[PDB]
Structure formats: structure tokens, C-alpha cells
Amino acid sequence: SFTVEKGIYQTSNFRVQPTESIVRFPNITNLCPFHEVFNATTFASVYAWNRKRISNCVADYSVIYNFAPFFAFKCYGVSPTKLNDLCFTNVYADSFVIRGNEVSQIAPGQTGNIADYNYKLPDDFTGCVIAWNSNKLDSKPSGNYNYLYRLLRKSKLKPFERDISTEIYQAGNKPCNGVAGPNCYSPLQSYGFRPTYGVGHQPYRVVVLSFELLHAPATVCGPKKSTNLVKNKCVNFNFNGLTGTGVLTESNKKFLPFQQFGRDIADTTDAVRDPQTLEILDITPCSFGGVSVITPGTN
């Protein structure tokens, strides 16, 4: 209406708003062991690429950045910026050592020698690929010979298969038993490594992560991190998995050592224990009320 008369009218309601955001969790436990595969003393050959599977653990991926300025970090599918959301179904990490300019052969779709006879990778794979230089750890000034690769074999490898089968190549048209000799060769040539080698011939350590999905168990594997806390301030709190809005204050309760929730007669939360540390806090709703406008006659 365009006019009002004498009286007090209940017009609106007022309340305070939260300022910060608080999240908490019972830290982490059972961490997936990425570190043990990223820092060892040996890395095996190329065609004998070690295989490992890990599951039923929480994941961090924070150890990835704690290394050298990675030569290549081309990861397909999932993006490093958003550290995934799903726990997939299983994950595998494959590690080996190759020679310099051969790192380009590790790709979804390509061809060559390493990615054709030694370690085949299908295009439908997404995973991630990591490679970094290690010239100062596995290169002695006498000729390294503990790394070998296959260079003479027919029937280009099918995706994700390993063939540790040393034989005598039958290049020719004669039977060959034992010593190769003429018109007959032996695969698995060595590498050689010296500290004065030029760039592109220095050793590189390569780790590829491949994970698969579409199954039921192990849905989400998140870090479930936590932040700081505030006192005497209208804020939104997310202790453990219970959310709320209000002001927290340390409470002189007698919580038994197996419970975290707290209630009252009217079935409302009024006491919560901290996830990480052991402390009980009472919760009070932020101030609110009604507003009345005492107005005399508008005439």
C-alpha cells in the first residue's frame, strides 16, 4: 500500500552471515606407496619392465613434484591440475630406463624400436607418462652394461605384453643352433653409458601410470585434507563429515572415548569433538531476530 497508519509492524528478520570456511578430517592413513617406486637404486632393463599393482590405500601424488624438473610430464586423459576424483578400480606403475631421444617413442600412437619391439603401448590408454634425466646415478666412466634392449625380433609386440625370451635370430635360410656365427644373430644388444656422453644419449628414468575403471569397488580415493580453525566467530564448520553453521566454544563436557557426536533434549547438535586433535566444542547458533518498524501515521 502507498499509505500506513499508526502502529508497530513486524516487517523483516535479521541474521548474521558466516565469514570463513572450516574443513577437517582424521588426517590420513594407509597411504599409497608412490615414493618407493620413484626413488630406488635400480630400475631394471627396458623389455623386462617391472609391473606392480596397488589398491586399498589413500593417494597423495604430492611426492611427484618433489623431484627434478621433469623432462616430460605429458599425461593423457586425467589432468594433473585436478588431481582426479575417482579411485578407478586398479592402478599400475611401470618403470624402466631408456636413452635420451627415445623418450618420444613412449606415446599413445607412434612407431619405432622401443615402442615397437620392447614396450608396446595402446592408444586407448590414457594414464600419465613421466621421464627425467639420471645421468649422475647410473653412468660410470668405464662403460655401463647392466641395461639391455631388444632390437631384432619379428611379430611386433601386442599392447601390454612382455617377452623375456633370449634366443638366436634366424635371419637367413639355414638352421641355427647354439652359436649364431654367419647368417645368424643374437638379440638383446647392450647400451653403454659414460658421463661425458652428449645430451640425447644420457640415461633417462621413465615411469608410466595406467589405471582402469568401470568396476564397483574403490570408488573415490581422495586426500581428505584439513585446514585451520577459529574461535568466537560465526562460521561454517565441517568437522569430520558433519556440517553446520555457528560459533564454536571450548566445552567442559565429559565425552566418552568412543563418541564424537553430541545432542540435547530437543535433538540438536551442541557438542562436537575435533577429528585430528582431542577437544570438545559447544556450538551456538549465530545471532538472529525480528525487526519491527514503529511508524506514526503517514499523514
Partner 1 sequence: TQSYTNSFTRGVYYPDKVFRSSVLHSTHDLFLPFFSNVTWFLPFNDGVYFASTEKSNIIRGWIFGTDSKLLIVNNATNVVIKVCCNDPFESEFRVYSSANNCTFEYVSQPFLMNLREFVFKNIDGYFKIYSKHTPINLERDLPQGFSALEPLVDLPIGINITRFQTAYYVGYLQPRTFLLKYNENGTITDAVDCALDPLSETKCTLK
Q: How far is CA 158 from CA 119, 154, 207, 261, in A?
A: 9, 12, 20, 56
Contact flag: residue 258 with partner 1 (CB under 8 A) = yes
Contact flag: residue 101 with a second copy (CB under 8 A) = no
* Closest approach of partner 1 to the CB of residue 298, in Å: 52
* Closest approach of a second copy to the CB of residue 72, in Å: 6
Contact flag: residue 42 with ligand NAG (CB under 6 A) = no
Q: Which stretch binds a second copy (CB under 8 A): 111-119, 148-156, 254-262, 280-288?
A: 148-156
Contact flag: residue 228 with ligand NAG (CB under 6 A) = no
Residue 226, amino acid: S
Whether residue 251 contacts residue 281, with contact meaning beta carbons closer than 8 Å, is answered with yes
Q: Which stretch binds a second copy (CB under 8 A): 33-41, 97-105, 186-194, 208-216?
A: 186-194
* Closest approach of ligand NAG to the CB of residue 44, in Å: 16
Contact flag: residue 256 with partner 1 (CB under 8 A) = yes
Contact flag: residue 170 with a second copy (CB under 8 A) = yes
Could you tell me which residues are beta bridge partners of residue 295?
7
* C-alpha torsion sign, points 225, 88, 31, 259: positive
At 50 the three-state DSSP class reads strand
Contact flag: residue 241 with partner 1 (CB under 8 A) = no
The partner in contact with residue 276, picked from partner 1, a second copy, ligand NAG, none with C-beta cut-offs of 5 to 8 angstroms by kind, is ligand NAG
Separation of CA 292 from chain center: 56
Task: Choose among 67, 54, 51, 61: nearest CA to 28.
Answer: 61
Residues 78-107 that bind partner 1 (CB under 8 A): none
Residues 10-29 that bind ligand NAG (CB under 6 A): 26-27
Whether residue 103 contacts residue 206, with contact meaning beta carbons closer than 8 Å, is answered with yes
Q: Which is nearer to partner 1, 214 or 265 (CB)?
A: 265
Q: Which is nearer to a second copy, 27 or 186 (CB)?
A: 186
Cβ count within 10 A of residue 195: 10
Q: To which residue does cell 613434484 refer? A: 65
Three cell numbers written together for 277: 586433535
Contact flag: residue 276 with ligand NAG (CB under 6 A) = yes
Three cell numbers written together for 35: 615414493
> In whole angstroms, what is the distance from residue 175 CA to residue 181 CA?
12
Contact flag: residue 260 with partner 1 (CB under 8 A) = yes
The partner in contact with residue 92, picked from a second copy, partner 1, ligand NAG, none with C-beta cut-offs of 5 to 8 angstroms by kind, is none
DSSP per-residue string spanning 82-99 = TT-S---SEEEEEEEEEE
Tell me how many residues contact partner 1 (CB under 8 A).
13
Q: Which is nearer to partner 1, 154 or 254 (CB)?
A: 254
Whether residue 171 contacts residue 116, with contact meaning beta carbons closer than 8 Å, is answered with no
Residues 11-70 that bind a second copy (CB under 8 A): 69-70
Q: Which stretch binds partner 1 (CB under 8 A): 3-11, 60-68, 86-94, 257-265?
A: 257-265
* Closest approach of partner 1 to the CB of residue 30, in Å: 11
> In whole angstroms, what is the distance from residue 176 CA to residue 184 CA?
7
* Closest approach of partner 1 to the CB of residue 58, in Å: 15
Could you tell me which residues are beta bridge partners of residue 294?
8
At 96 the three-state DSSP class reads strand
What residues make contact with ligand NAG under the rule CB under 6 A?
26-27, 39, 254, 276-277
